[PDB]
Amino acid sequence: EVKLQESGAELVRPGASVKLSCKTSGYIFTSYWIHWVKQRAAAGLEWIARIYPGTGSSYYNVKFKGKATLTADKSSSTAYMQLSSLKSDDSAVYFCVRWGFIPVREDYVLDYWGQGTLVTVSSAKTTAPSVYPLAPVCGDTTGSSVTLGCLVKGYFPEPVTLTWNSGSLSSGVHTFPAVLQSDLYTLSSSVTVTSSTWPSQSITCNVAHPASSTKVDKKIEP
Amino acid sequence: DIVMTQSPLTLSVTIGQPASISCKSSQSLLYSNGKTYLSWLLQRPGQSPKRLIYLVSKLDSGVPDRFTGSGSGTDFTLKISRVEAADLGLYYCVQGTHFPYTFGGGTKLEILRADAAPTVSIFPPSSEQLTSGGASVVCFLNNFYPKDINVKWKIDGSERQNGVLNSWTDQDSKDSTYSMSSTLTLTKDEYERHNSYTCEATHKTSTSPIVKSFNRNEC
Ligand SMILES: O=C(O)CNC(=O)CCCP(=O)(O)OCc1ccc([N+](=O)[O-])cc1
């Protein structure tokens, strides 16, 4: 079963270098080209380069010549992309792709994509978030159903993981995309349950921020 | 490099109806071996892209045949015979006839559903936050459609514009609505200096705006 497992999100300083990995499984590694694609939050996709692990033969988009360097480790079946001279505009999500085009055949096999590695190039320092419970005072819905919330603010870098009751509460929840303001992020989430569920039972907001080794649980009390 | 132009930039289609996207290249994509390397990708919200079509009209496996592609030279089209809620997302055409490979700009397909008014909720600051000398007033505006909405904050009747942090989700595939969060942050002492807080939403579903509000008094 083809799987392309990419490395974790990275916080990198400007001018520095990053080595992104793409561990593959489920097919003969040396037999297919691996491509690297960039996606910057602007619905834009850009082709960087490709490598044939069987020979180490690589092709680069001139825009990235110098910036990117592909390597492949035949023993561990892992392809790599090194990015250098980083600057803020290099912050994006980079994908490794087993595209599927077979040159000799000039035909196609199914494409498999890695999950993507989000790279944040900044000199901002890592900061743990403050988690606040949001219980209704007026805005609530009140009768029939009630909506609670969780505010996660002042953290860096992304991402943060937020769940309700460890994820057992999944319907009726909306987690809003983090917004960066002055080198710090803010994220919120709401959960709507019936009036009979809460306060009767416990509803907790679980927040994790691995960048800072933070894991907090906030119970929403009346 | 070959520029790939897609149109429309965005389209709203109702479920059950047909749709079509266009992609234009700055140069012919006809290769000397008689093949035209033009593919179509779909990237659903919070997912990696995934090809649907290769060589202008060949469909990948696991793909329902509601999707068909056609065109030649510089003109290409993706056609969906019948749109489903799952079609939501960004569509891209890419060319591999010319090096380096270049992608189109993208076309967002959004599902057009019946108008739905927001359910608005308001929350005062948490004791925990106030204890840190800060105060965030939060307003959630959930499950609405269309996406255009306008919210205003008012402290004791007057409009506050500074200190607002808004965030919208993308269209939910399950119900085709959007949700939005609006947080107004103040200092603890400025917060305690006022009485009523209000969140007002102006949206096409009504001529009179939805207003959620709370008075801070004591107790
Ligand atoms: O290389 C050349 O100059 C001539 N062209 C070719 O040999 C064929 C390229 C075919 P194709 O696989 O379609 O390449 C385009 C292409 C490749 C990778 C990709 N991707 O998203 O990973 C997107 C698009």
Tab-separated table of N, CA and C and ligand atoms in Angstrom, chain A residues 35-37 45 47 50 97-103 108 113, chain B residues 31 37-39 41 51 54-55 94-99 101-103, ligand 1:
chain	number	residue	atom	x	y	z
A	35	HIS	N	8.487	13.958	-7.132
A	35	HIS	CA	8.446	15.390	-7.438
A	35	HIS	C	8.189	16.176	-6.175
A	36	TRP	N	8.633	17.427	-6.157
A	36	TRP	CA	8.386	18.296	-5.016
A	36	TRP	C	7.575	19.488	-5.497
A	37	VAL	N	6.478	19.757	-4.784
A	37	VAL	CA	5.550	20.840	-5.108
A	37	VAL	C	5.366	21.797	-3.931
A	45	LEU	N	-0.049	26.530	-6.694
A	45	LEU	CA	0.806	25.357	-6.719
A	45	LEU	C	1.979	25.656	-7.631
A	47	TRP	N	5.742	23.921	-9.192
A	47	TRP	CA	6.608	22.757	-9.363
A	47	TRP	C	8.069	23.136	-9.153
A	50	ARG	N	12.218	17.242	-9.558
A	50	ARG	CA	11.981	15.805	-9.516
A	50	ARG	C	13.306	15.054	-9.456
A	97	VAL	N	5.577	14.051	-4.110
A	97	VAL	CA	4.548	13.365	-4.876
A	97	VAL	C	5.126	12.235	-5.720
A	98	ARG	N	4.493	11.067	-5.682
A	98	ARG	CA	4.882	9.993	-6.566
A	98	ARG	C	3.833	10.154	-7.680
A	99	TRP	N	4.116	11.107	-8.564
A	99	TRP	CA	3.250	11.507	-9.671
A	99	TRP	C	2.677	10.411	-10.566
A	100	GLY	N	3.460	9.389	-10.904
A	100	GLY	CA	2.921	8.299	-11.701
A	100	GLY	C	3.181	8.259	-13.186
A	101	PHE	N	3.750	9.311	-13.763
A	101	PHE	CA	4.056	9.305	-15.194
A	101	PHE	C	5.285	8.425	-15.421
A	102	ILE	N	5.157	7.465	-16.319
A	102	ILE	CA	6.248	6.556	-16.605
A	102	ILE	C	6.785	7.002	-17.946
A	103	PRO	N	7.920	7.732	-17.951
A	103	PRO	CA	8.577	8.247	-19.154
A	103	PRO	C	8.754	7.251	-20.288
A	108	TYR	N	0.569	6.751	-17.554
A	108	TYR	CA	0.420	7.101	-16.165
A	108	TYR	C	-0.062	6.030	-15.255
A	113	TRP	N	0.371	11.353	-2.893
A	113	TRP	CA	0.934	12.590	-2.338
A	113	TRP	C	1.322	12.441	-0.871
B	31	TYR	N	2.741	18.014	-27.906
B	31	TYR	CA	4.128	17.586	-27.889
B	31	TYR	C	4.454	16.934	-29.234
B	37	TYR	N	0.263	16.899	-22.749
B	37	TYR	CA	0.316	16.638	-21.332
B	37	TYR	C	-0.392	17.700	-20.510
B	38	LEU	N	-1.706	17.578	-20.394
B	38	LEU	CA	-2.488	18.520	-19.601
B	38	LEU	C	-3.297	17.666	-18.623
B	39	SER	N	-3.156	17.967	-17.339
B	39	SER	CA	-3.831	17.239	-16.279
B	39	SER	C	-4.702	18.195	-15.470
B	41	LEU	N	-6.372	18.671	-11.455
B	41	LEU	CA	-6.276	18.275	-10.048
B	41	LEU	C	-7.427	18.893	-9.281
B	51	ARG	N	-4.926	14.266	-8.598
B	51	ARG	CA	-5.264	14.333	-9.998
B	51	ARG	C	-6.584	13.614	-10.266
B	54	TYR	N	-5.630	12.954	-16.658
B	54	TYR	CA	-4.328	13.109	-17.290
B	54	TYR	C	-4.497	12.957	-18.817
B	55	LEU	N	-3.526	13.483	-19.563
B	55	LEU	CA	-3.517	13.456	-21.018
B	55	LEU	C	-4.798	14.009	-21.580
B	94	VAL	N	-2.577	21.732	-15.123
B	94	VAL	CA	-1.113	21.814	-15.082
B	94	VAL	C	-0.677	21.339	-16.455
B	95	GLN	N	0.433	21.868	-16.950
B	95	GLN	CA	0.945	21.396	-18.232
B	95	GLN	C	2.366	20.828	-18.024
B	96	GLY	N	2.676	19.752	-18.724
B	96	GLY	CA	4.002	19.182	-18.612
B	96	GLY	C	4.682	19.057	-19.955
B	97	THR	N	4.138	19.745	-20.956
B	97	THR	CA	4.690	19.705	-22.301
B	97	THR	C	5.929	20.596	-22.349
B	98	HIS	N	5.890	21.686	-21.596
B	98	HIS	CA	7.011	22.619	-21.568
B	98	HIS	C	7.675	22.623	-20.174
B	99	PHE	N	9.001	22.646	-20.144
B	99	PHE	CA	9.740	22.689	-18.891
B	99	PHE	C	10.032	24.175	-18.619
B	101	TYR	N	7.354	22.736	-15.524
B	101	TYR	CA	5.933	22.464	-15.452
B	101	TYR	C	5.228	23.626	-14.739
B	102	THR	N	4.099	24.066	-15.306
B	102	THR	CA	3.350	25.189	-14.756
B	102	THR	C	1.859	24.882	-14.555
B	103	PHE	N	1.347	25.344	-13.413
B	103	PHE	CA	-0.039	25.198	-12.971
B	103	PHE	C	-0.904	26.421	-13.268
C	1	LIG	O1	10.150	17.219	-19.633
C	1	LIG	C1	9.836	17.748	-20.731
C	1	LIG	O2	10.429	18.777	-21.176
C	1	LIG	C2	8.797	17.106	-21.640
C	1	LIG	N1	7.710	16.697	-20.973
C	1	LIG	C3	7.616	15.421	-20.526
C	1	LIG	O3	8.515	14.651	-20.722
C	1	LIG	C4	6.387	14.930	-19.808
C	1	LIG	C5	5.887	15.594	-18.534
C	1	LIG	C6	4.564	14.890	-18.264
C	1	LIG	P1	3.719	15.196	-16.792
C	1	LIG	O4	3.936	14.119	-15.927
C	1	LIG	O5	2.397	15.518	-17.088
C	1	LIG	O6	4.422	16.453	-16.113
C	1	LIG	C7	3.658	17.572	-15.621
C	1	LIG	C8	3.594	17.505	-14.154
C	1	LIG	C9	4.526	16.763	-13.374
C	1	LIG	C10	4.415	16.698	-11.994
C	1	LIG	C11	3.356	17.386	-11.413
C	1	LIG	N2	3.067	17.325	-10.006
C	1	LIG	O7	2.101	18.030	-9.595
C	1	LIG	O8	3.716	16.590	-9.250
C	1	LIG	C12	2.440	18.127	-12.182
C	1	LIG	C13	2.556	18.190	-13.560
